[PDB]
Design a protein around this ligand. Structure first.
Ligand SMILES: NC(=[NH2+])NCCC[C@H](N)C(=O)O
Ligand SMILES: [Mg+2]
Ligand SMILES: [Mg+2]
Ligand SMILES: [Mg+2]
Ligand SMILES: [Mg+2]
Ligand SMILES: [Mg+2]
Ligand SMILES: [Mg+2]
Ligand SMILES: [Mg+2]
Ligand SMILES: [Mg+2]
Ligand SMILES: [Mg+2]
Ligand SMILES: [Mg+2]
Ligand SMILES: [Mg+2]
Ligand SMILES: [Mg+2]
Ligand SMILES: [Mg+2]
Ligand SMILES: [Mg+2]
Ligand SMILES: [Mg+2]
Ligand SMILES: [Mg+2]
Ligand SMILES: [Mg+2]
Ligand SMILES: [Mg+2]
Ligand SMILES: [Mg+2]
Ligand SMILES: [Mg+2]
Ligand SMILES: [Mg+2]
Ligand SMILES: [Mg+2]
Ligand SMILES: [Mg+2]
Ligand SMILES: [Mg+2]
Ligand SMILES: [Mg+2]
Ligand SMILES: [Mg+2]
Ligand SMILES: [Mg+2]
Ligand SMILES: [Mg+2]
Ligand SMILES: [Mg+2]
Ligand SMILES: [Mg+2]
Ligand SMILES: [Mg+2]
Ligand SMILES: [Mg+2]
Ligand SMILES: [Mg+2]
Ligand SMILES: [Mg+2]
Ligand SMILES: [Mg+2]
Ligand SMILES: [Mg+2]
Ligand SMILES: [Mg+2]
Ligand SMILES: [Mg+2]
Ligand SMILES: [Mg+2]
Ligand SMILES: [Mg+2]
Ligand SMILES: [Mg+2]
Ligand SMILES: [Mg+2]
Ligand SMILES: [Mg+2]
Ligand SMILES: [Mg+2]
Ligand SMILES: [Mg+2]
Ligand SMILES: [Mg+2]
Ligand SMILES: [Mg+2]
Ligand SMILES: [Mg+2]
Ligand SMILES: [Mg+2]
Ligand SMILES: [Mg+2]
Ligand SMILES: [Mg+2]
Ligand SMILES: [Mg+2]
Ligand SMILES: [Mg+2]
Ligand SMILES: [Mg+2]
Ligand SMILES: [Mg+2]
Ligand SMILES: [Mg+2]
Ligand SMILES: [Mg+2]
Ligand SMILES: [Mg+2]
Ligand SMILES: [Mg+2]
Ligand SMILES: [Mg+2]
Ligand SMILES: [Mg+2]
Ligand SMILES: [Mg+2]
Ligand SMILES: [Mg+2]
Ligand SMILES: [Mg+2]
Ligand SMILES: [Mg+2]
Ligand SMILES: [Mg+2]
Ligand SMILES: [Mg+2]
Ligand SMILES: [Mg+2]
Ligand SMILES: [Mg+2]
Ligand SMILES: [Mg+2]
Ligand SMILES: [Mg+2]
Ligand SMILES: [Mg+2]
Ligand SMILES: [Mg+2]
Ligand SMILES: [Mg+2]
Ligand SMILES: [Mg+2]
Ligand SMILES: [Mg+2]
Ligand SMILES: [Mg+2]
Ligand SMILES: [Mg+2]
Ligand SMILES: [Mg+2]
Ligand SMILES: [Mg+2]
Ligand SMILES: [Mg+2]
Ligand SMILES: [Mg+2]
Ligand SMILES: [Mg+2]
Ligand SMILES: [Mg+2]
Ligand SMILES: [Mg+2]
Ligand SMILES: [Mg+2]
Ligand SMILES: [Mg+2]
Ligand SMILES: [Mg+2]
Ligand SMILES: [Mg+2]
Ligand SMILES: [Mg+2]
Ligand SMILES: [Mg+2]
Ligand SMILES: [Mg+2]
Ligand SMILES: [Mg+2]
Ligand SMILES: [Mg+2]
Ligand SMILES: [Mg+2]
Ligand SMILES: [Mg+2]
Ligand SMILES: [Mg+2]
Ligand SMILES: [Mg+2]
Ligand SMILES: [Mg+2]
Ligand SMILES: [Mg+2]
Ligand SMILES: [Mg+2]
Ligand SMILES: [Mg+2]
Ligand SMILES: [Mg+2]
Ligand SMILES: [Mg+2]
Ligand SMILES: [Mg+2]
Ligand SMILES: [Mg+2]
Ligand SMILES: [Mg+2]
Ligand SMILES: [Mg+2]
Ligand SMILES: [Mg+2]
Ligand SMILES: [Mg+2]
Ligand SMILES: [Mg+2]
Ligand SMILES: [Zn+2]
Ligand SMILES: [Zn+2]
Lengths: 69, 53, 77, 110, 141, 181
RNA sequence: CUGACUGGGGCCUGUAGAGCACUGAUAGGGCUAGGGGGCCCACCAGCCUACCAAACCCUGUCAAACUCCGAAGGGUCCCAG
RNA sequence: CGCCUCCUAAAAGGUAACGGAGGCGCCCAAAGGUCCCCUCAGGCGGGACGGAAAUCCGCCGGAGAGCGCAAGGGUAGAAGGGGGCCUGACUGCGAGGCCUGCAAGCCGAGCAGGGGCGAAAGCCGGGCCUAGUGAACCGGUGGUCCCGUGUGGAAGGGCCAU
RNA sequence: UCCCCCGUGCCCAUAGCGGCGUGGAACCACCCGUUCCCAUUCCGAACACGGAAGUGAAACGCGCCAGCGCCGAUGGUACUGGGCGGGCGACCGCCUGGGAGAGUAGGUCGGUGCGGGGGA
């Protein structure tokens, strides 16, 4: 590589919120990230964050069978 | 040749004689031409300067 | 009624000037041409206007080299 | 469809052939280096030299030099003195350069 | 009627009418053809009159193939001027036609119909013509 | 060459699975990563603050490689574009730097992508290469909110020695490329 | 003795003719972006076209300023009459 | 109304008309020399903003792109694109020719001086080429130090360059 | 003087495209590295250097295949130098010498020189 025009790559720790630590290389030796592949909802099986709801509607009303028959 | 593309002389900077005629575009090349050139009087190459024709 | 044509330029007298087997002297113009319809071969130079001319005394020889073009050679006598 | 390599080769070689000198061609493989001095007018090789033929051994540059010296010695034996260097597709540098320098040390003229 | 949509040059030298047709001498589409017996410049208006005569005869049905095209500009000087002052203006377009040319072909029609239509068409043209029928000779071309 | 997890993961786990999945008879026949090419289309730097040196500084922090300027082949009326104008950045990553970039790309970058539902399965060359585009540079761990003036994304070409999309799909997913469908 | 003219040999050429590979023209058919139109929608798509049609392919053609080709001749040099 | 390109022009050259079509009266300090490197248009597939067309990736693609500008010839085995160093866009000449009524116009190896690039072979006396131009006369400016009306100077001229 | 490979020429597609098969001992290539020389408008991709674990996957070489591309008769014709006729003309013929282009039959998945290294 041409000298003096590139950022040097050093060993690096990327630290996620989930406690994941990634040993890699970068131009900044320490980095914090809010998310990573190990915790992100799309990756983790299908950990459906807040809504694993399943619609819920529309026959999901059932309040109730009370009309006459 | 035109108003902007002028004719000019090259003067041997050492003995002051005009040895070459040529042209330049004074919009593109506003500074005086400086060129090494053979001077037949000095019998060697010499920096020649642009001088009004 | 009038014409906006009526122009033409002087004919330039281009072409081969010395054909194969002709005895030429060095400097003899061999071909006047636009671009390289003929290419300089052995003992033939080429001028800034593509003019082919003999570099040595000798005999003119032509050669057609397919995709490599037609060449004009001079063979020393 | 030609390659950069093929074009580069033609380009430097065509230029050499125009001058009409005996042509010193150099082939450089990953392992070896070869030289033949060629008469392009008769389409014949006059003298040859290579690392493969001399069973040379060590550092590729120092080897190149030696095959150069060798080519020279044989060449001078045939009365071949003046030559034109055909670097072909190679930069004039390193191994090729070394061979060239070795040829010159031997008294090949170029 | 027929004329080039566009061209490289507005005006053409007149040229010559020597020889039999270059090509176009065998029936290539229809069952019957109208062949040129004499050389001529055939005008676009002649061609159209021939066409219209044939569709008029057919009334409804049949297919006409027009195998010549007037791409040659026809030139005439404005009336009562003298010679000189440049080439006259383009007044029309003509198809160069030489002996043996199949100018028109018909199909989808009975022999009686085709014979008659091509006859009437021939009367609109400035040359002698011949009616022909598709042949093995044509097929072998 | 550096010990890097993804690179190691390619040789240790990915190669055997690929040899398995397709049964190559030659070690050279199995899908390899040739280069990753990153391109910033930019040209919002055509005139104006034609200092895209801000962007080049950003690309270099991301890749460890200084991008090279791209210039307009011809002049263009409607994009307001004259020949030779500096319109973009392009960096060709190979070997250890290529692995390192993809490594962070999978682990960190793509996760940080907004409303990420996975890479587009259909974006394959047809000849076994893949391409994806980004909206922001903030995706990457190297870039923070402080140090960035504006939002500029990029194009990413991942070139493979694989002859088919099938093979290329196999290799890339094995490496950890997360596909939606 | 070199001449016109002629025999042999080599080189140069782009006409006649022809051709359509290039530049353009070109009828019909096929195939098929693009519109016109009709069903059916504003929920953004669909289906039908004896409608005008680009590119492409087929059949058939056109050209002083077209040529993948290409004569007869013509020119020039050498030896000989 | 001079000049350039094509056709007319009858396959060497040349060839007319108030015959058919277009251009020129500039330009470039690099768009010049050399050394090194690189190869197009276009089609298809892929890619944030990005579109028919900006930049990126892959495949096909001999030249249909490019070559400042008309047209023709030529051309990637570069004349096209990029970079380094540069000024040969030399001085003094010039075998030999092309063209040709004259006068012009054109090509030019090679020798010498002092250079540029290159390891070298070598190339370089502007520009891919063909238009971008104007004989004398009269006069200007720089140089030269040749003439200088009895002599020394001077006036004024000559010569070289413009 | 025979076969294989490596260089380098010549003919200038009968030599090319595509398909298939084949070769690593040798040679060639990819390859292993990027300390050193040298190098990237970024990149050891290229250029370059030092190597020698591996693979003939890519490239290259060598076979086979006629889908394409390329080549292509013999006949006959057009045209025509020279010589003659005919038509009022546009134009049409005869004699003698020359003679295409298109197309048909068919051909082609190269041939050959010089020097190296290896094999018999
Ligand atoms: N050289 C020749 N024989 N030319 C023949 C042409 C003469 C005449 N026009 C003819 O058709 O017969
Ligand atoms: Mg360094
Ligand atoms: Mg007028
Ligand atoms: Mg005229
Ligand atoms: Mg005039
Ligand atoms: Mg004239
Ligand atoms: Mg003239
Ligand atoms: Mg002329
Ligand atoms: Mg000639
Ligand atoms: Mg020259
Ligand atoms: Mg020149
Ligand atoms: Mg011969
Ligand atoms: Mg010869
Ligand atoms: Mg006339
Ligand atoms: Mg009439
Ligand atoms: Mg008329
Ligand atoms: Mg009158
Ligand atoms: Mg007139
Ligand atoms: Mg008229
Ligand atoms: Mg009319
Ligand atoms: Mg006809
Ligand atoms: Mg009639
Ligand atoms: Mg036919
Ligand atoms: Mg491996
Ligand atoms: Mg796809
Ligand atoms: Mg691939
Ligand atoms: Mg970030
Ligand atoms: Mg005599
Ligand atoms: Mg004589
Ligand atoms: Mg004579
Ligand atoms: Mg004779
Ligand atoms: Mg004709
Ligand atoms: Mg055509
Ligand atoms: Mg055809
Ligand atoms: Mg004609
Ligand atoms: Mg014709
Ligand atoms: Mg003509
Ligand atoms: Mg013609
Ligand atoms: Mg032929
Ligand atoms: Mg002849
Ligand atoms: Mg003759
Ligand atoms: Mg003769
Ligand atoms: Mg005699
Ligand atoms: Mg003429
Ligand atoms: Mg002519
Ligand atoms: Mg002529
Ligand atoms: Mg003639
Ligand atoms: Mg003459
Ligand atoms: Mg007039
Ligand atoms: Mg004018
Ligand atoms: Mg420069
Ligand atoms: Mg330069
Ligand atoms: Mg492209
Ligand atoms: Mg696209
Ligand atoms: Mg988009
Ligand atoms: Mg796009
Ligand atoms: Mg072009
Ligand atoms: Mg350059
Ligand atoms: Mg210097
Ligand atoms: Mg002279
Ligand atoms: Mg004269
Ligand atoms: Mg002139
Ligand atoms: Mg000198
Ligand atoms: Mg010197
Ligand atoms: Mg020198
Ligand atoms: Mg030096
Ligand atoms: Mg020198
Ligand atoms: Mg010279
Ligand atoms: Mg130029
Ligand atoms: Mg010029
Ligand atoms: Mg140049
Ligand atoms: Mg002049
Ligand atoms: Mg004057
Ligand atoms: Mg007077
Ligand atoms: Mg005076
Ligand atoms: Mg004076
Ligand atoms: Mg005195
Ligand atoms: Mg006195
Ligand atoms: Mg005194
Ligand atoms: Mg005195
Ligand atoms: Mg005084
Ligand atoms: Mg005085
Ligand atoms: Mg003067
Ligand atoms: Mg070989
Ligand atoms: Mg093959
Ligand atoms: Mg095998
Ligand atoms: Mg193979
Ligand atoms: Mg091996
Ligand atoms: Mg083995
Ligand atoms: Mg280092
Ligand atoms: Mg070291
Ligand atoms: Mg490497
Ligand atoms: Mg290499
Ligand atoms: Mg090794
Ligand atoms: Mg293989
Ligand atoms: Mg190779
Ligand atoms: Mg066979
Ligand atoms: Mg042929
Ligand atoms: Mg044939
Ligand atoms: Mg025959
Ligand atoms: Mg006759
Ligand atoms: Mg007549
Ligand atoms: Mg006849
Ligand atoms: Mg006859
Ligand atoms: Mg005969
Ligand atoms: Mg012919
Ligand atoms: Mg034939
Ligand atoms: Mg073949
Ligand atoms: Mg060979
Ligand atoms: Mg030979
Ligand atoms: Mg051998
Ligand atoms: Mg041997
Ligand atoms: Zn996490
Ligand atoms: Zn001086």
């Amino acid at each position: 590589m041409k000298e003096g025009i590139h950022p040097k790559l050093v060993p690096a720790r990327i630290i996620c919120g989930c406690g994941n630590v990634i040993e890699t290389y970068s131009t900044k030796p320490e980095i914090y990230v809010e998310v990573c592949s190990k915790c992100h909802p799309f990756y983790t099986g299908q950990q459906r964050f807040v809504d694993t709801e399943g619609r819920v509607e529309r026959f999901q009303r059932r309040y109730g069978d009370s009309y006459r028959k | 040749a035109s108003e902007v593309r002028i004719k000019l002389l090259l003067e041997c900077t050492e003995c002051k004689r005009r040895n070459y005629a040529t042209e330049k575009n004074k919009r593109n090349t506003p500074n005086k031409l400086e060129l090494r050139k053979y001077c037949p009087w000095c019998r060697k190459h010499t920096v020649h300067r642009e001088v009004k024709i | 009624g009038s014409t906006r044509n009526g122009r033409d330029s002087q004919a330039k007298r281009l072409g081969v000037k010395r054909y194969e087997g002709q005895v030429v002297r060095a400097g003899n113009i061999l071909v006047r041409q636009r671009g390289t319809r003929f290419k300089p071969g052995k003992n033939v130079g080429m001028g800034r206007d593509f003019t082919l001319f003999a570099l040595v005394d000798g005999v003119v020889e032509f050669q057609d080299r397919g995709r490599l073009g037609r060449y004009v050679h001079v063979r020393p006598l | 469809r030609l390659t950069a390599y093929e074009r580069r080769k033609f380009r430097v070689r065509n230029r050499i052939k125009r001058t009409g000198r005996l042509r010193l061609s150099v082939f450089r493989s990953l392992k070896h280096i070869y030289a033949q001095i060629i008469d392009d007018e008769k389409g014949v090789t006059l003298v040859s030299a290579s690392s493969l033929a001399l069973k040379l051994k060590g550092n590729k540059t120092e080897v190149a030099r030696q095959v150069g010296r060798a080519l020279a010695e044989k060449a001078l034996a045939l009365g071949i003195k003046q030559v034109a260097f055909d670097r072909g597709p190679y930069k004039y540098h390193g191994r090729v350069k070394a061979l060239a320098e070795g040829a010159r040390e031997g008294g090949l003229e170029f | 009627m027929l004329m080039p949509r566009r061209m490289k040059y507005r005006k053409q030298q007149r040229g010559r009418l020597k020889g039999a047709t270059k090509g176009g001498d065998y029936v290539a589409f229809g069952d019957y053809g109208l062949v040129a017996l004499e050389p001529a410049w055939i005008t676009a208006q002649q061609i159209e009159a021939a066409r219209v005569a044939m569709v008029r005869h057919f009334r409804r049905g049949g297919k006409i193939f027009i195998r010549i095209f007037p791409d040659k500009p026809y030139t005439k000087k404005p009336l009562e001027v003298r010679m000189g002052k440049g080439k006259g203006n383009v007044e029309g377009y003509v198809a160069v036609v030489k002996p043996g040319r199949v100018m028109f072909e018909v199909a989808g029609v009975t022999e009686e119909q085709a014979m008659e239509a091509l006859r009437i068409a021939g009367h609109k043209l400035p040359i002698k013509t011949k009616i022909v029928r598709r042949d093995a000779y044509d097929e072998a071309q | 060459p550096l010990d890097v997890a993804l690179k190691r993961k390619y040789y240790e786990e990915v190669r055997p699975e690929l040899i398995r999945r397709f049964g190559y008879q030659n070690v050279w026949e199995v899908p390899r990563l040739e280069k990753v090419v990153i391109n910033q289309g930019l040209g919002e730097a055509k005139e104006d603050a034609r200092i895209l040196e801000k962007a080049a500084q950003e690309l270099a922090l991301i890749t460890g490689q200084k991008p090279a300027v791209t210039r307009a082949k011809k002049s263009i009326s409607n994009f307001k574009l004259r020949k030779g104008m500096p319109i973009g950045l392009r960096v060709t990553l190979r070997r250890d730097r290529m692995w390192i970039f993809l490594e962070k790309l999978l682990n960190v970058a793509l996760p940080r992508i907004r409303d990420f539902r996975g890479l587009n399965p259909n974006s394959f060359d047809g000849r076994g290469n893949y391409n994806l585009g980004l909206r922001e540079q903030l995706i990457f761990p190297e870039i923070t909110y402080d140090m960035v003036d504006a939002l500029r994304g990029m194009d990413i070409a991942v070139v493979t020695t694989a002859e088919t999309d099938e093979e290329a799909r196999a290799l890339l997913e094995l490496l950890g490329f997360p596909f939606r469908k």
